[PDB]
A paper describes a structure:
The TMAO reductase TorA is a monomeric, bis-molybdopterin guanine dinucleotide (bis-MGD) cofactor-containing enzyme that belongs to the dimethyl sulfoxide reductase family of molybdoenzymes. TMAO reduction involves a membrane-associated pentahemic c-type cytochrome TorC and a molybdenum-containing periplasmic enzyme TorA as a terminal reductase. TorA belongs to the DMSO reductase family of molybdoenzymes and can reduce only TMAO, unlike R. capsulatus DorA, the DMSO reductase in this bacterium which reduces both N- and S-oxides. TorC is required for anaerobic growth in the presence of TMAO; it shuttles electrons from the menaquinone pool to TorA in the periplasm.
Residue numbers in the entry: 49 to 838
The structure:
């Protein structure tokens, strides 16, 4: 049939080939010099056994609805129903919950979904429900849950998703680059809008500068990252810090900087507040313990003199701090993010090209010069009319909670917690809807999630693959992939390089529907179809989005062609006039005219506002707090001696494309997710490559396939997140996961009272070669379909 069909995804733009109605090969877009291997999984993603073929309802839920046996969730026994029957039940449940409980019982949830301006699954969900009634909202996300709360308070920006100093300037000016828990090479494969991958050009240049010894790269990381491996182990200075001891390391660098007069007094005095209130802590005047190189050597396992050497090197020349997000996705994650800023402040290079800090470097091609282009605005969740049932009665519970507290809300309703200076009362949720997110991938401590779901009346999942979420649902609705629809997207993110047409590759498979059509038909049930669609279909909406784009471009001085011209004749437009950027430079150059958005206008090393909250676990300046569990001598490490990283996958985006055999064949071990193990740790357990091992703690147990790797320091392991949950006894708490989802082993706790964010990477485990029976993996084969024989 058809060859060279242009479209896009989180993993990049493709030229798709179709043969006899099947998507068979995905070639890289011709402008993409650095495509991701993951595009090879996209045909499988469209055509594999886990694709949701039709609406499905959990046997006993179909029988008894909200009066059903919730214990059977997870058993994977579902009945096919018609679309109209499914949508009716959906509507009737919305009606029932609104009448019985009101808006405090209802939660929606969304996530990374797919690229595409119109086919915005989160927007479809939010709009449809918002046209029916009120619900519990959430604040924050799992990416930068801690950082995005603390950083506004201390540097007046969210920071984490923002543009970074242009790489050309970094490469011409920085002499030391500090990668602090950041894997650029691995994580720039997938971006929010279709990636252009042009940032990899800069990484190649960096590689050459490293080889020539012009730039020294320091990696502060328990593991040799993909980036480190790429730049070269012979060249990269590796600080293999003990997991979760980064704050001690930060404080000791700060101490050294002060102790040896390497700090910038002028910068601290003129661009910051509160340094004087922090120093007594740092120096041990108010506790007897200097937060010094000697002190930190005990915690971090880094030689004190190496700590001092690091500080001195950072101060000695132009130094770029590149901070990732993983180190704030753990207990008290705000502390580490805050100390990145403090350390950068003490160095005094903030606002210089290739100096200072940033958190956005691994995301959205950050550091690529931004072009003078157009950014389209997609289908919004926003409504202009009130809900049909506009009940404001949340019965004395809060109407917004932190995103990661939703299970705590189900299990501990009425619990009162602090959140970033406010008081929150967790509502008794009864009905959850998921569209474009996978909770059994995303959230922590799956056995507790199981217990939480068992208190729910109704669970609805809408997806294009039969995920672990779908396995634990009551109603499952088949959404399409983006490859079965038409759309528009940005090409490039921070670069704003271009815009691409997403042309339909194949027709909707089976009776899968675009989320637009799902929620449109739902809205018809309560007479709000028109308010949802705004009188437009797919191609109408795409034309509307483009035209708004055309209007934005005129008056910004960028000319776009007409829609039909673009769609049918061009398919791709590219922008020009790339701009250099230096982050924080405006503030550095004129702090009076360009103040930070902080209480003082300055960098808050001490925050009176935070101090006044009276949170013992997030005080007025950064502090070392001991963790609920930590490796290398921390709590629990006598029982569970290994730190388990749940790092972002190299061969998927989260749980997406786990079902691809094309990709799995490249990294699976014994048919399972690989677990990475240090050679000394492996030899102590008699473990070797290919072994089926049990990774366990007091929270859960999983099976995985051992990879013995010297990239891992002793006492550090990894199972990449996104490995699907596959319980041996479906639905039972304490089931052994046969594929190896790390969130079976994580703990579900708030970072601190400030952010109340996910602490996913605060995880201790043991590993042993497994002595039980290895059953077949059942993760990727859909449900057990059930039929009425009567
Ligand atoms: N390929 C790919 N897959 C994805 O799933 C993906 N997801 C995207 C999203 S949504 C996000 S949030 C980002 C992920 O952003 P994030 O920064 O979380 O990335 P990771 O690669 O998981 O972790 C970065 C590094 O932290 C290190 N690290 C772990 N624990 C510690 C510790 O205690 N101390 C120190 N110093 N380092 C530590 C890890 O070893 C790793 O090299 O990537 C984005 N890009 C993505 N690309
Ligand atoms: N242990 C642990 N460590 C971690 O580092 C960690 N990181 C966290 C982070 S940073 C993030 S971003 C979250 C990610 O959590 P998130 O839930 O966002 O992850 P995905 O696996 O991308 O799930 C998206 C789902 O939407 C579906 N989908 C895609 N397109 C569509 C569409 O058009 N319509 C519909 N209806 N569905 C669609 C996909 O099939 C997929 O199942 O995981 C978090 N969880 C984490 N846990
Ligand atoms: Mo994220």
């Amino acid at each position: 049939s058809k060859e060279g069909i242009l479209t896009g995804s989180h993993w990049g733009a493709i030229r798709a080939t179709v043969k006899d109605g099947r998507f068979v090969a995905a070639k890289p877009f011709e402008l993409d010099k650095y495509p991701s291997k993951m595009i090879a999984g996209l045909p499988d993603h469209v055509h594999n056994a886990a694709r949701i073929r039709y609406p499905m309802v959990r046997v006993d839920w179909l029988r008894k609805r909200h009066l059903s046996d919730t214990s059977q969730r997870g058993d994977n026994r579902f009945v096919r129903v018609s679309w109209d029957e499914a949508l009716d039940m959906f509507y009737e449940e919305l009606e029932r919950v609104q009448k019985t409980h009101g808006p405090s019982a209802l939660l929606t949830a969304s996530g990374w979904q797919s690229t595409g301006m119109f086919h915005n699954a989160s927007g479809m969900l939010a709009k449809a429900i918002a046209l029916h009634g009120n619900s519990v909202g959430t604040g924050g996300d799992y990416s930068t849950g801690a950082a995005q709360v603390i950083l506004p308070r201390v540097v007046g920006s969210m920071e984490v998703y923002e543009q970074q100093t242009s790489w050309p300037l970094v490469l011409q000016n920085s002499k030391t680059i500090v990668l602090w828990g950041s894997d650029l090479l691995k994580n720039q494969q997938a971006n929010w809008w279709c990636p252009d991958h042009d940032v990899y050009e800069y990484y190649a240049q960096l590689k050459a500068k490293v080889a020539a010894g012009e730039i020294e790269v320091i990696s502060i990381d328990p593991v040799v990252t993909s980036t480190h491996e790429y730049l070269g182990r012979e060249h990269v200075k590796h600080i293999a810090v003990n997991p979760q001891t980064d704050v001690p390391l930060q404080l000791a660098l700060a101490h050294t900087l002060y102790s040896e007069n390497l700090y910038d007094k002028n910068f601290l005095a003129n661009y910051c507040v509160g340094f004087e209130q922090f120093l007594p802590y740092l120096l041990g005047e108010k506790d007897g313990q200097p937060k010094d190189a000697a002190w930190a050597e005990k915690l971090t396992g880094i030689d004190a003199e190496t700590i001092r050497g690091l500080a001195r090197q950072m101060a000695a020349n132009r130094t770029q701090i590149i901070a990732g997000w993983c180190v704030q996705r753990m207990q008290h994650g705000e502390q580490w993010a805050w100390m990145i800023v403090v350390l950068a402040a003490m160095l005094g290079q903030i606002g210089l090209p290739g100096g200072g800090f940033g958190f956005g470097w691994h995301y959205n091609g950050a550091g690529t010069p931004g072009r003078k282009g157009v950014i389209l605005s997609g289908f919004s969740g926003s409504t202009s009319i009130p809900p049909v049932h506009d009940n404001s009665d949340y019965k004395g519970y809060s109407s917004t909670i932190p995103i990661a507290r939703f299970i705590d809300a189900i299990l501990e309703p009425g619990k009162v917690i602090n959140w970033n200076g406010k008081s929150v009362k967790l509502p008794p949720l009864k009905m959850c809807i998921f569209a474009g997110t996978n909770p059994f991938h995303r959230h922590q401590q799956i056995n507790r999630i199981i217990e939480g779901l068992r208190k729910l009346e109704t669970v609805i999942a809408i997806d294009n693959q039969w995920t672990s979420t779908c396995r634990f649902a009551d109603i499952v609705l088949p959404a399409t992939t983006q490859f079965e629809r038409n759309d528009l997207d940005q090409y490039g993110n921070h670069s704003n390089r271009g815009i691409i047409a997403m042309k339909q590759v194949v027709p909707p498979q089976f009776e899968a529907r675009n989320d637009f059509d799902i929620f449109r038909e739902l809205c018809r049930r309560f007479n709000r179809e028109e308010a949802f669609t705004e009188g437009l279909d797919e191609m109408g909406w795409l034309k509307r989005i483009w035209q708004e784009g055309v209007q934005q471009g005129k008056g910004r001085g960028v000319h776009l062609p007409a829609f039909d011209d673009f769609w049918n004749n061009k398919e791709y437009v590219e922008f020009d006039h790339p701009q250099m950027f230096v982050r924080h430079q405006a503030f550095r150059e004129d702090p009076d005219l360009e103040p930070l958005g902080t209480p003082s206008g300055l960098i808050e090393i001490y925050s009176k506002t935070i101090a006044d909250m009276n949170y013992d676990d997030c005080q007025g300046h950064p502090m070392w707090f001991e963790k609920i569990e930590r490796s290398h001598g921390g709590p629990g490490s006598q029982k569970y001696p290994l730190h388990l990283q749940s790092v972002h996958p190299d061969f998927r985006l989260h749980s997406q494309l786990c079902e691809s055999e094309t990709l799995r064949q490249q990294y699976t071990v014994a048919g399972k997710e690989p677990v990475f193990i240090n050679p000394q740790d492996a030899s102590a357990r008699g473990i070797r490559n290919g072994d089926v091992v049990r990774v366990f703690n007091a929270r859960g147990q999983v099976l995985a396939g051992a990879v013995v790797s010297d990239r891992y320091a002793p006492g550090v392991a990894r199972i990449h997140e996104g490995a699907w949950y596959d319980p041996d006894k479906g639905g039972e708490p304490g089931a052994l996961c046969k594929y190896g989802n790390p969130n079976v082993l994580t703990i579900d706790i708030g970072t601190s009272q400030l952010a109340q964010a996910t602490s996913a990477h605060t995880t201790l485990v043991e590993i042993e070669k497994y002595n039980g029976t290895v059953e077949q993996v059942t993760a990727f084969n859909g449900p057990v379909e059930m039929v009425a024989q009567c």
